[PDB]
Homo-oligomer: A and B are copies of this chain.
Amino acid sequence: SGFKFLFFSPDGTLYGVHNDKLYKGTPPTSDKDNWLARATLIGNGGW
């Protein structure tokens, strides 16, 4: 459904695997902060 992995890098950046893709970005600060919309895609498949 949602994320397969969700975890932090030691610099404070949030990482997530969603639909076999890897994303990173600063963690959301409120429910009005759409994280996936602004996260950087860093893995297109295989995760």
In the complex, the chain B residue whose C-beta lies closest to that of A24 is B27
**Alpha-carbon distance between A31 and B43 when the two chains are bound, in angstroms:** 4
In the complex, the chain B residue whose C-beta lies closest to that of A2 is B47
Using a Cβ–Cβ cut-off of 8 Å, how many residues does chain A contribute to the interface with B?
A: 34
**Alpha-carbon distance between A21 and B47 when the two chains are bound, in angstroms:** 14
Interface pair A12/B12, CB less than 8 Å apart: no
- Residues of B near A21 (CB, < 8 A) are 31
Beyond A3-B46, A9-B27, A10-B10, 14 additional pairs, beta carbon < 8 A = A3-B5, A3-B47, A6-B15, A7-B7, A24-B27, A27-B42, A28-B43, A30-B41, A30-B42, A31-B41, A31-B43, A31-B44, A33-B43, A35-B43
